[PDB]
Swiss-Prot record, chain A:
Originating species: Escherichia phage lambda (Bacteriophage lambda)
Function noted in UniProt: Mediates the switch from middle to viral late gene expression by associating with host RNA polymerase (RNAP) so that the latter can read without pausing and through transcription terminators preceding late genes. Competes with host factor sigma 70 for binding to RPOB, the beta-subunit of host RNAP. To join the elongation complex, binds a specific DNA Q-binding element (QBE) and interacts with RNAP that is paused during early elongation. Participates in the lysis-lysogeny decision by activating the expression of the late lytic genes.
Site (Interaction with host RNA polymerase sigma factor RPOD): 90
DNA-binding interval(s): 127-148
Quaternary state and interactors: Interacts with host RPOB (via flap domain); this interaction renders host RNAP resistant to transcription pausing and allows it to read through termination signals. Interacts with host RNA polymerase sigma factor RPOD (via domain-4). Interacts with host NUSA (via N-terminus and AR2 domain); this interaction releases the autoinhibition of NUSA.
Residues of the full protein shown: 45 to 207 of 207
Effect annotated for changing residue 145 to E: Increased suppressor activity
UniProt key word Zinc-finger: yes
Similarity comment: Belongs to the phage antitermination Q type 2 family.
Keywords from the UniProt entry: DNA-binding, Host-virus interaction, Metal-binding, Transcription, Transcription regulation, Transcription termination, Zinc, Zinc-finger
GO terms, biological process: DNA-templated transcription termination; transcription antitermination
Name assigned to this protein: Antitermination protein Q
Curated annotation (Swiss-Prot), chain B:
Signal sequence segment: none
Coiled-coil residues: none
Protein family per UniProt: Belongs to the RNA polymerase beta' chain family.
Biotechnology: Co-administration of salinamide and rifampicin or salinamide and myxopyronin suppresses the emergence of resistance to both antibiotics.
Disulfide bridge map: none
Name by which UniProt lists this protein: DNA-directed RNA polymerase subunit beta'
Subunit structure comment from the entry: The RNAP catalytic core consists of 2 alpha, 1 beta, 1 beta' and 1 omega subunit. When a sigma factor is associated with the core the holoenzyme is formed, which can initiate transcription. The rRNA transcription and antitermination complex (rrnTAC) consists of RNAP, NusA, NusB, NusE (rpsJ), NusG, SubB, ribosomal protein S4, DNA and precursor rRNA; S4 is more flexible than other subunits.
Function per UniProt: DNA-dependent RNA polymerase (RNAP) catalyzes the transcription of DNA into RNA using the four ribonucleoside triphosphates as substrates. Resistance to the antibiotics salinamide A, salinamide B, rifampicin, streptolydigin, CBR703, myxopyronin, and lipiarmycin can result from mutations in this protein.
Post-translational modification: Acetylated on several lysine residues in the presence of glucose.
Gene name of this polypeptide: rpoC
Swiss-Prot record, chain F:
Regions that span the bilayer: none
Listed name of the protein: DNA-directed RNA polymerase subunit beta
Function description: DNA-dependent RNA polymerase catalyzes the transcription of DNA into RNA using the four ribonucleoside triphosphates as substrates.
Naturally occurring in which organism (per UniProt): Escherichia coli O157:H7
Family designation: Belongs to the RNA polymerase beta chain family.
UniProt subunit comment: The RNAP catalytic core consists of 2 alpha, 1 beta, 1 beta' and 1 omega subunit. When a sigma factor is associated with the core the holoenzyme is formed, which can initiate transcription.
Highest taxon in the source lineage: Bacteria
Encoding gene, per UniProt annotation: rpoB
DNA sequence: TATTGAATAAAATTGGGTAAATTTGACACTATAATGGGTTCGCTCGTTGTGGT
DNA sequence: ACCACAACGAGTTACCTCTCCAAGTGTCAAATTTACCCAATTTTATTCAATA
RNA sequence: UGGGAGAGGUA
């Protein structure tokens, strides 16, 4: 609820101080999930806390990355994700559209996890892309799909009291 | 500037420059101060901004008029401690 | 009123950046103060001409008492009465135009804060105070 | 947020295109059928931004779901409308044109940069005389300005050995072809041979300009404009009037003239127009750009339909009604009121009478905070309707908020620093501010219709500055001289003068009184007058060589009124300051002596008591004015 | 573009109150400071309290003595009207009323008009006395007026003190004022500078388009200007935080003033100031003039 | 659309329409005070300037393109007084109103 | 006198006072110079056989019955037999071009049979603009071969002009330049591949026009000086009539525009009146010029004040519905395309004809 | 109509009449102004006039 | 019994380009004679920048 | 070198109150976008096995 | 929306 409104309003940059609140809430959620996963709890307090905080910022930035991110819009569809078919409009006559072939309709270009991997491997260098793929990235897309659930339940608790 | 240059030149062992002080008027001194923002907000904004754009000046924001235009604490009164703290922070680091 | 307002604005802008940024600049320069005796009478006595200033050096005379005020003393009413009872006519006090400080003045070269009665605290906009003090009685002129 | 200095320089054409967001091509501001701005115009939403917050122009992406997309129906990026006052544009001028500041702001600095007369430079820019730029022969040295006759016969003489041009392109070619460091070393060479101070000052001015150009690192050909930047269209809005018609802005009109003449010059240049027509169009574009940058500088100012000259960008920067003096050095300010002032003769030196409706408007978010702290209001709208209906608990919370929260009272013109002072407000009925009578000298206020502004300090630091610096009890002495600004004026003065002044055979003369309390008893009972010469026993005090007060008692010869004034004179002052007829100078000397002996707080209490007894005894005197 | 206009006409009845500018015909202006009770007002030996108490210190340095002479002549006029009112309340005659009104009309030294009441009827004299019972109106021409001798003869006709000064008593203590006080009738005007029209306060309202500063005026609910001179006053005090909050959070700091409003509602008296939007406007205008000015990140 | 002069006003109590007539206009002789409504006017479907307290709530939830704005002629604050004359000037061509 | 003035309309009226007014004969012989210029460029493009085969392919392209001959030929029922005569001219200029005064008499006969073609102006300047872009292609080609002659020599290039003003097609000038052995010729062996590219370009252009380089070079020189004299006569005509522009723009002054803008739009209108002026109509110039001047000034001041092809052929031409539609109705309802629908109509006309 | 309405509406001497009392109306009608079209100018005049 | 360094498909993303749709600005619409314009001074004081002997 | 003319700028602070500020419609070449083709790269999963 | 002029007035 409050996590959903804070993360959404910090993503779309309104009341622009709840981004840090979303970082801290996702860090506490990482504290919650790190007890039931193997490769995350292999460190001490300060190091694991710092790398999970910067991983929370990276997962929130992966949630914050929209079609209005500076340097992330699709070059062809201009963010829309909808192009016209000249051939199908010629053989049909009716107005028809297709999925944008470049960005596959999502509108923008998503953020790679290897930037986060390079940003965190300057503290712990012995973890590699096998370990990053088999251990870290399930936690990473778990956080971003969880923040999607948080946004959607904020949307449901909003349209239950407004509609 | 002449006094500071003569200070450091007689410190490191040079000859130093000689000068002759000039009594500017009140308007001419306000327009010939080394803060182009203060001089432009006083008077003759066309002339002052033209000369400052040609010379490529920069205002270091050391005066009360400059820190009022910018919207900060002035270096006077209760803002003086904050301004010398900011000066030692930008000088140490 | 129009002319005095324009004069006050010119004075504030010529003196806007002057702030007491030191306690003592460490100079020996001064201004020889004297009672103005222009015309046929004394116009301003030495007591109020020097009251609140800071002496550039000692006063040196055999005189009637051989009074030796120290260097850099804030002249209160007590020291004014001392100079009156010891009959002094020329005192050298540290002025603002002979201050050794760069980008501001020292507190000793200014002297007494006329609004509070003690020495001036470092960080007081004496240029704005002086410009308003000169440009206020222009309506009375 | 974090920045140290502010730098100023000339603007390169690549930098002018770098701030831009799209080239402005058409001069239409908005369509007048529907209120929608035209594409590539002065208000174009594809260039400057959408007119609604998170909504495209044609109405295709109206939600915040698309936080930015370029709507392919109308090209508009779906973002907030705050970017309309921040995104610039640019116009690509066909012929380059001179900047009017770097031409007609004396000294011209293009004529000073090239050692050319401004008359010759304007003759070149007005397409009247050619100027050579380079020449392979020795007959035509550089900057030799030729007329049309000399240009045609030199064309029949040499033809291709030289190349002379005209207009601002010639001056841009001259500035681009000049050599900065070579002119620097040549001028530093030529400085030594001359001996006249005028020629030497000219050489030092030119070498200072050249050294300033080299040390800044700009290029001298950036004084000739090839790209012209456009102000964002929410900083030059199209305000609608009450008739349905518009009062369009002067910047929109000047940009419209510049764009129309630039587009016509593009058409005449690609149409292969005659040289006279294309020179007239280039000259007109030069005049339009110069008008837009500074209307009244070069020729006659382009006036609008109302016979008034158009406000340019320089007219928006400079002057009393310009940006600095009207909106940057002084602003308009929230949490501030204004009312007519009256007398506060019952007040103390730190108090002012503030009306209840004025204070209820000034202190409204503090009232909302106290309402939501006490739980009386559930939400902000409930607190707002509670203040809108003005409950008795709203007036009680206002009484709680007002207490120990100073306000600043200010009267214009604020000539000296005691034109703003801080006071602790007293909630009064009525609509006028009540000012203490002893601060009216420092305010230069009377009560014939003066008004004062109230200002509420919000932050804790501002409240502490008002309490510790700007409080009226904190500045008793002037900042100009050391003398007190709190002098009693004319009614206190008339009352204390009538009090202390003696008479020879008034009533109850020659008595011997036990003290000032018996003198007050005699006067209030009616057995003695204020001016009866009488003998009372005055116990006066005196500070010793240390800080302790020694007491002494004697039989003084005085009047009854001086004995009653001794009841309010504090402990530490002698009877000699009371034992004469007190005028304005004597009361001011008494207050200054009380200051120098006792300090600040007994001086403030003494000034209050002086005001009260002077008012009371001037009233009991019954002084009047008759024709006799 | 107009469908219909509805024009409503209010009608306010405005009473005097403290704050209202009142004036006489001699440049004797001023503001009502207090509306006193009639038991508190000073009164004469007949118990009639005065209506307005004016300061005599406004007379000598301003030299408008026609104020005092109008006061004396108005006292004499109201004394004559009081005698006519006493005769009309006693319902005496028409002959004594005709005699007294004629005796009051023939008092001047060499006055031009000759008002003869023998040509008057009885109902005409009764109507004249019914219009004269509230005071006898007196024409005093400019540079042709009554003198002190005429004023004192009129005051002696009306059984009034010829010096124009009576004994007044304090309404509160009951005691007598020591010196005799000038009491009379002066013509006072209510000027159009009413404190209902001058009183205006604002907390937060609407803002200008370009500068994002508050508006100006009682009509559009604007804030008071904190001008250059007031900025100099705060600079001379040293009130840097007060000056900074005048410059930013009470003014053109759009993201700072909403923070300050919510901080005040949350009971936290602390601001977070930022850059003035008018300074951003000025930077954009100097950039539009073809001059690259920019803030420098150290 | 046109702005309507009408009796119904969104989001006011019955302490506002206590002095209006059936057409939205005030009665001749009504002892109104400050803040009362003399003639109610509502904008068409779509507001004209939105407050930031609910501008974010119209952004993230959706501007309804409905729920018209209160734009009524109110008595200014601190101003009492009766109403002595009303005059309605309608444009030539349309049917006016019952009160007009 | 130049100098102490700043009013730009005053400077315009001063600088326009140099020229003089024209008599009745002045428009006649300046129009004679105009006709001389356009007939000069017409006869210099008439001798080119590429223009002849271009007008023949234009003839059997318009003979496919997709457009009427009204917007092809104005005048001289006769165009068919005259184009058969032009085809006979084509086959005689194709078979006896090999032998050499027969080429001279046949190009002289092409130029005189070219002159009676009183065709429309737009197709004519479109086709000679196709000639213009191909001679601009060979112009930048010869400019490209001059700069590749210069860019590695670093010598006085005058001797290469003396050995290059011959035929400049074979390699005899190349061997005569390298073999004589001045100090550039031994280090000028790196030009061999680009001059061989120039030789294959020369054989390519020899087979694409059947004509050498010097004759097309001086014919391009002749048409360039012809169009230069035509443009100079147009400029000398249009500079001597700006007083008419000021006299017509004298009435529209305080109607929304500044005075100089009105006379600039009038100068544009006067230039458009000069460009399409006919002198065999009795009226001198002014009654034809004033319509264009008034039209430009009033227009400026008023401005300042398959399946898809089948259904757009239905809706645009109005085939079996209630109301017909123009390009704007379908350009609103179907897609934001406006003139693209017109090119769809053109493609459908091409695919149906 | 444009000329006379421009004058009578927005000249410098076509003034919004003061009618507080009858004295204000009679004094506004009996007023003489040294300023106006072709007269003096306010900031550009001194003690001589 | 397991987690992970190296290696590798492999599809998504960046960058470049490119031929075909598609905008975009202009132009048509036309022939008695006409041929050179309307717009501010009763402001002072001072300062700085320009031109002859 | 010194004098005699032109042009800019400045002139108190607020505060108020008012009024006043013609008709689309069809056609052409160019250039501009636009849907899309394809190498370089690189991010992510997936196999081997090899230490632990 | 809320700008710019002009006029008048107050201290
Ligand atoms: Mg006053
Ligand atoms: Zn896409
Ligand atoms: Zn010092
Ligand atoms: Zn759209």
């Amino acid at each position: 609820a409050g996590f959903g409104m804070a993360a959404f309003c910090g993503k779309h940059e309104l009341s622009q101080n709840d981004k840090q609140k979303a970082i801290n809430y996702l860090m506490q959620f990482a504290h919650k999930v790190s007890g039931k996963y193997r490769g995350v709890a292999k460190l001490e307090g300060n190091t694991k806390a710092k790398v999970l905080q910067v991983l929370a910022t990276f997962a929130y930035a992966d949630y914050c990355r929209s079609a209005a991110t500076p340097g992330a819009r699709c070059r062809d569809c201009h963010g829309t994700g909808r192009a016209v078919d000249i051939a199908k409009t010629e053989l049909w006559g009716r107005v028809v559209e297709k999925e944008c072939g470049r960005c596959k309709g999502v509108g923008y270009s998503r953020m790679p996890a290897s930037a986060a991997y390079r940003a965190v491997t300057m503290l712990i260098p012995n973890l590699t892309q096998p370990t990053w793929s088999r251990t870290v990235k399930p936690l990473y897309d778990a956080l971003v799909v969880q923040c999607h659930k948080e946004e959607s339940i904020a949307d449901n608790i909003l349209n239950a009291v407004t509609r | 500037r002449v006094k500071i240059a003569n200070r450091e030149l007689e410190a490191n062992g040079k000859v130093g420059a000689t000068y002759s002080r000039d009594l500017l008027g009140i308007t001419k001194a306000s327009l010939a101060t080394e803060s182009f923002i203060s001089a432009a907000s006083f008077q003759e904004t066309t002339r002052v901004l033209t000369e400052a754009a040609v010379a490529g000046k920069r205002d270091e924001l050391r005066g009360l008029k400059e820190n009022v235009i910018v919207g900060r604490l002035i270096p006077a009164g209760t803002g003086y401690a904050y301004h010398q703290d900011r000066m030692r922070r930008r000088a140490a680091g | 009123t129009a002319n005095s307002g324009y004069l006050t604005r010119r004075l504030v802008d010529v003196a806007q950046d002057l702030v007491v940024t030191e306690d003592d600049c460490g100079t020996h320069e001064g201004i020889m103060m004297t009672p103005v005796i222009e015309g046929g009478d004394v116009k301003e006595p030495l007591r109020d001409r020097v009251l609140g200033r800071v002496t550039a050096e000692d006063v040196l005379k055999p005189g009637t008492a051989d009074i030796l005020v120290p260097r850099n003393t804030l002249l209160h009413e007590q020291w004014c009465d001392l100079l009156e009872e010891n009959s002094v006519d020329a005192v050298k006090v540290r002025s603002v135009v002979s201050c050794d400080t760069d980008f501001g003045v020292c507190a000793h070269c200014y002297g007494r804060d006329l609004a509070r009665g003690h020495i001036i605290n470092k960080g007081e906009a004496i240029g704005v105070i002086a410009a308003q003090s000169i440009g206020e009685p222009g309506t009375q002129l | 947020e974090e920045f140290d200095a502010i730098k100023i320089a000339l603007a390169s054409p690549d930098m002018i295109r770098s701030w831009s967001f799209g080239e402005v091509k058409k001069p239409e501001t908005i369509n007048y059928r529907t209120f929608k701005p035209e594409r590539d115009g002065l208000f174009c939403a594809r260039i400057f931004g959408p007119v609604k917050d998170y909504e495209c122009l044609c109405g295709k992406y109206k939600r915040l779901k698309h936080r930015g997309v370029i709507c392919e129906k109308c090209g508009v990026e779906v973002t907030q409308t705050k970017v309309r006052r921040e995104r610039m544009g640019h116009i690509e001028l066909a012929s380059p044109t001179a900047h009017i500041w770097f031409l007609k702001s004396l000294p011209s600095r293009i004529g000073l940069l090239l050692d050319m007369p401004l008359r010759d430079i304007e003759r070149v820019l007005y397409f009247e005389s050619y100027v050579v730029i380079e020449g392979g022969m020795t007959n035509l040295e550089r900057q030799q300005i030729l007329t049309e006759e000399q240009y045609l016969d030199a064309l029949e003489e040499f033809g291709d050995e030289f190349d002379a041009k005209m207009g601002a392109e010639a001056i841009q070619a001259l500035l681009k072809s000049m050599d900065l460091e070579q002119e620097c070393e040549q001028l530093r060479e030529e400085l030594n041979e001359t001996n006249s101070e005028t020629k030497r000052k000219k050489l030092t001015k030119r070498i200072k300009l050249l050294e300033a150009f080299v040390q800044s690192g700009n290029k001298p050909e950036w004084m000739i404009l090839t790209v012209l930047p456009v102000l964002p269209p929410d900083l030059r809005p199209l305000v609608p009037l009450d008739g349905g018609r518009f009062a369009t802005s002067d910047l929109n009109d000047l940009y419209r003239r510049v764009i129309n003449r630039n587009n016509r010059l593009k058409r005449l240049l690609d149409l292969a127009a005659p040289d006279i027509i294309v020179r007239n169009e280039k000259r007109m574009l030069q005049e339009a750009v110069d008008a837009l940058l500074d209307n009244g500088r070069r020729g006659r100012a382009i006036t609008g339909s109302n016979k008034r000259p158009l406000k340019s960008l320089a007219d928006m920067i400079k002057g009393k009604q310009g940006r600095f003096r009207q909106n940057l050095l002084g602003k308009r300010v929230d949490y501030s009121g204004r009312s007519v002032i009256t007398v506060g003769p019952y007040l103390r030196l730190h108090q002012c009478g503030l009306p209840k409706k004025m204070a209820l408007e000034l202190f409204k978010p503090f009232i909302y905070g106290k309402l939501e702290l006490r739980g009386l209001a559930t939400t902000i709208k409930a607190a707002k309707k509670m203040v809108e209906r003005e409950e008795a608990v709203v007036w009680d919370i206002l009484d709680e908020v007002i207490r120990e929260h100073p306000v600043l009272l200010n009267r214009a013109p604020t000539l000296h620093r005691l034109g703003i002072q801080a006071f602790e407000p007293v909630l009064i009925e009525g609509k006028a501010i009540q000012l203490h009578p002893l601060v009216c000298a420092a305010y230069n206020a009377d009560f014939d219709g003066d008004q004062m502004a109230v200002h509420v300090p919000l932050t804790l630091e501002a409240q502490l500055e008002a309490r510790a610096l700007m409080m009226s009890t904190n500045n008793i002495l002037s900042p100009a001289n050391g003398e007190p600004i709190i002098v009693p004026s004319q009614d206190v003065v008339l009352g204390l003068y009538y009090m202390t002044r003696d008479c020879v055979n008034a009533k109850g003369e020659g008595m011997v009184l036990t003290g000032p309390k018996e003198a007050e008893r005699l006067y209030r009972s009616g057995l003695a007058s204020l001016h009866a010469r009488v003998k009372v026993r005055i116990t006066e005090y005196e500070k010793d060589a240390n800080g302790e007060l020694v007491a002494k008692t004697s039989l003084k010869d005085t009047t009854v009124g001086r004995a009653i004034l001794w009841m309010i004179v504090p402990k530490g002052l002698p009877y000699s300051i009371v034992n004469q007829a007190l005028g304005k100078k004597a009361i001011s000397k008494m207050l200054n002596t009380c200051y120098r002996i006792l300090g600040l707080k007994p001086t403030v209490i003494f000034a209050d008591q002086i005001m009260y007894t002077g008012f009371a005894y001037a009233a009991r005197s019954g002084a009047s004015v008759g024709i006799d | 573009g107009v469908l219909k206009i509805v024009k409503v006409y209010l009608a306010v009845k405005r009473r005097i109150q403290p704050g209202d500018k009142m004036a006489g015909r001699h440049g004797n202006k001023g503001v009502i400071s207090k509306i006193n009770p009639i038991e508190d007002m000073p009164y004469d030996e007949n118990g009639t309290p005065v209506d307005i108490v004016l300061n005599p210190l406004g007379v000598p340095s301003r030299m408008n003595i026609g104020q005092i002479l109008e006061t004396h002549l108005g006292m004499a006029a109201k004394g004559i009207g009081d005698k006519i009112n006493a005769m009309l309340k006693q319902q005496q005659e028409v002959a004594k009323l005709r005699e007294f009104i004629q005796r009051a009309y023939d008092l001047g030294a060499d006055v031009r008009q000759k008002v003869d009441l023998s040509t008057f009827s009885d109902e005409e004299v009764m109507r004249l006395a019914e219009n004269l019972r509230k005071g006898m109106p007196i024409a005093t021409p400019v540079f042709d007026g009554a003198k002190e001798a005429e004023i004192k003869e009129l005051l002696k006709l009306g059984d009034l003190p010829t010096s124009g000064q009576i004994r007044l008593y304090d309404g509160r203590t009951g005691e007598q004022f020591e010196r005799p006080v000038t009491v009379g009738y002066m013509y006072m005007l209510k000027l159009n500078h009413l404190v209902d029209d001058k009183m205006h306060a604002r907390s937060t309202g609407s803002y200008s388009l370009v500068t994002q500063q508050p508006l100006g005026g009682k009509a559009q609910f604007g804030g008071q200007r904190f001008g250059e001179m007031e900025v100099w006053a705060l600079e001379a005090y040293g009130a840097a935080y007060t000056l900074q909050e005048m410059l930013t959070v009470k003014s053109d700091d759009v993201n700072g003033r909403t923070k300050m409003y919510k901080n005040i509602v949350d009971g936290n008296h602390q601001m977070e100031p930022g850059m003035p939007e008018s300074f951003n406007v000025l930077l954009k205008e100097i950039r539009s003039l073809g001059i690259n000015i920019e803030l420098e990140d150290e | 659309g046109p702005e309507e002069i009408t009796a119904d006003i969104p989001n006011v109590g019955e302490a506002a329409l206590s002095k209006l007539d059936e057409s939205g206009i005030v009665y001749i002789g009504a002892e109104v005070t400050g803040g009362d409504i003399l003639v109610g006017k509502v904008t068409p479907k779509g507001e004209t300037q939105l407050t930031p307290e609910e501008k974010l709530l119209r952004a993230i939830f959706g501007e309804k393109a409905s729920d018209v704005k209160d734009s009524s002629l109110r008595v200014p604050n601190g101003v009492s007084g009766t109403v002595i004359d009303v005059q309605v000037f309608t444009r030539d061509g349309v049917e006016k109103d019952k009160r007009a | 006198e130049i100098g102490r003035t700043t009013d730009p309309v005053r400077m315009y009226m001063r600088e326009m006072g140099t020229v003089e007014l024209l008599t009745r004969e002045g428009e006649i012989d300046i129009a004679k110079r105009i006709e001389d210029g356009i007939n000069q460029v017409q006869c210099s493009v008439a001798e080119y056989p590429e223009a002849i085969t271009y007008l023949l392919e234009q003839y059997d392209r318009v003979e496919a019955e997709e457009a009427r001959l009204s917007d092809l030929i104005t005048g001289f029922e006769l165009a068919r037999e005259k184009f058969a005569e032009l085809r006979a001219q084509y086959v005689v200029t194709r078979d006896t071009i090999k032998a050499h005064a027969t080429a001279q008499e046949e190009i002289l006969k092409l130029s005189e049979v070219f002159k009676q073609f009183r065709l429309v102006p737009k197709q004519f300047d479109y086709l000679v603009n196709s000639m213009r872009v191909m001679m601009d292609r060979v112009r930048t080609q010869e400019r490209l071969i001059m700069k590749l002659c210069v860019e590695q020599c670093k010598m006085p290039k005058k001797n290469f002009i003396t050995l290059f003003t011959g035929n400049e097609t074979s390699d005899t000038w190349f061997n005569a330049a390298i073999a004589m052995n001045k100090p550039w010729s031994e280090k000028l062996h790196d030009v061999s591949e680009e001059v061989h590219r120039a030789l294959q370009k020369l054989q390519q252009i020899e087979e694409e026009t059947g004509l050498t380089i010097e004759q097309v070079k001086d014919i391009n020189r002749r048409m360039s000086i012809g169009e230069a004299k035509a443009r100079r006569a147009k400029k000398e005509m249009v500079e001597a009539n700006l007083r008419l522009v000021i006299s017509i723009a004298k009435k529209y002054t305080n109607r929304g525009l500044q005075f100089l803008d009105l006379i600039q739009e009038g100068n544009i209108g006067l230039m458009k009146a000069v460009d399409k002026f006919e002198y065999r109509r009795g009226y001198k110039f002014s009654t034809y010029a004033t319509w264009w001047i008034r039209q430009a000034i009033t227009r400026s001041i008023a401005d300042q004040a398959t399946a898809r092809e089948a259904k757009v052929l239905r809706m645009r031409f109005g085939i079996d519905m209630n109301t017909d539609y123009t390009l704007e109705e379908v350009g609103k309802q179907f897609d934001v395309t406006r003139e693209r629908i017109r090119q769809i109509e053109a493609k459908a006309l091409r695919k149906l004809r | 109509s444009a000329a006379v309405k421009e004058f009578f509406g927005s000249s410098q001497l076509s003034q919004f009449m003061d009618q507080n009392n009858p004295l204000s109306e009679i004094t506004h009608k009996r007023r003489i102004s040294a300023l106006g079209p072709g007269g003096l100018t306010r900031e550009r005049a001194g003690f001589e006039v």
